[PDB]
C-alpha cells in the first residue's frame, strides 16, 4: 500500500533513467520495424551487394583509420558488432548507476556486476531491435536480414542465430520499455556473480527490484498469467545464451587470426 506506492515510484524512476540512458527504445524500434514512423526508412542489407552499397553510409566513422580496409565481410561485420557492444556497455553502465543503491556498493562489486551482467542485458535489449527476419542496426539507420547473417562463413554465420531464437520467444511476451527497465535492473543486481565481496546489500536491492517487477507485470499485463515466473526463466535462459556465446568466441580465438578485440570487451571476457 505505502510499500506498493513506493514500488511504482521506483518503477517510474527506472523507466525515466532507462529513457535517459538508451537512445533507441523498444517503442522507437518497433515503430521502425512495423513501418509506423515518419522518419527515414532503414537501409536493408540482405546480400553482399546491398552490404557494399550501404556500409559506408551507416558504419561508424572511426573504427579504422581510413574506413576502407581489406578485411573480409564476416570480420568487418564482427568489428561492427564489437563497436555496438562497446557503446551498449557504456549505456548499460550509465543506467546501472541510476539504480538506487548501486553507486554506494563496493566499487569492485559494481565492476563484477557489470562484467557478468552486461551481455545478458545486451541480448535482452537486442530483442527489442529484432523480428524473426532481421535486426535494426546503426541506431535504426540499417536493417540486416537474419538470412544474410546466417549466410556468413561457417564460424561467423552462427553467432546471431541463437539471439534471434531467443528474441522471437522473448518478444512474444510483449514487454514494453517500462517492464524492461525493471527486468534489466533485476539482472544487474544478481548476488550470485563470481567474486562478489558483499552479497547481502546486492540481494537486498534485488529483492526490492523483484517486488517492483512483480507489481509492474500484474498492473501492466493483468491478463498475462505467470508472466513474472516466465521472466525469471528468461533470466536463466540468458545465462545459457551467454555461456554459448563465450564458447563460440573461444573458437574464434583459436581458428581465426588477426582478430582485434576491443579492450573493453577484453576486460569483460577475461575469465
Amino acid at each position: 500500500g505505502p510499500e506498493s506506492a513506493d514500488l511504482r515510484a521506483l518503477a517510474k524512476h527506472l523507466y525515466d533513467s532507462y529513457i535517459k540512458s538508451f537512445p533507441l527504445t523498444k517503442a522507437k524500434a518497433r515503430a521502425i520495424l512495423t513501418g509506423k514512423t515518419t522518419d527515414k526508412s532503414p537501409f536493408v542489407i540482405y546480400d553482399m551487394n546491398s552490404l557494399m552499397m550501404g556500409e559506408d553510409k551507416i558504419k561508424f566513422k572511426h573504427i579504422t583509420p581510413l574506413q576502407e580496409q581489406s578485411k573480409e565481410v564476416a570480420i568487418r561485420i564482427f568489428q561492427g558488432c564489437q563497436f555496438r557492444s562497446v557503446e551498449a556497455v557504456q549505456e548499460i553502465t550509465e543506467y546501472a548507476k541510476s539504480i538506487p543503491g548501486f553507486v554506494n556498493l563496493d566499487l569492485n562489486d559494481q565492476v563484477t556486476l557489470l562484467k557478468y551482467g552486461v551481455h545478458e542485458i545486451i541480448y535482452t535489449m537486442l530483442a527489442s531491435l529484432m523480428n524473426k527476419d532481421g535486426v535494426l542496426i546503426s541506431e535504426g539507420q540499417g536493417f540486416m536480414t537474419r538470412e544474410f547473417l546466417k549466410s556468413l562463413r561457417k564460424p561467423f554465420g552462427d553467432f546471431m542465430e541463437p539471439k534471434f531464437e531467443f528474441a522471437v520467444k522473448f518478444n512474444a511476451l510483449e514487454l514494453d520499455d517500462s517492464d524492461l527497465a525493471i527486468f534489466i535492473a533485476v539482472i544487474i543486481l544478481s548476488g550470485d556473480r563470481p567474486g562478489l565481496l558483499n552479497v547481502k546489500p546486492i540481494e537486498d536491492i534485488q529483492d526490492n527490484l523483484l517486488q517492483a517487477l512483480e507489481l509492474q507485470l500484474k498492473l501492466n499485463h493483468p491478463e498475462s498469467s505467470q508472466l513474472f515466473a516466465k521472466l525469471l526463466q528468461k533470466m536463466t535462459d540468458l545465462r545459457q545464451i551467454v555461456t554459448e556465446h563465450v564458447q563460440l568466441l573461444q573458437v574464434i580465438k583459436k581458428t581465426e587470426t588477426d582478430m582485434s578485440l576491443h579492450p573493453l570487451l577484453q576486460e569483460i571476457y577475461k575469465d
Partner: peptide
C-alpha cells in the same frame, strides 16, 4: 591491467 569498467563507473555526467 587497469579496469576500464571502473573508469566508466567513476565518471560523472
Amino acid at each position: 591491467e587497469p579496469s576500464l569498467l571502473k573508469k566508466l563507473l567513476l565518471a560523472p555526467a
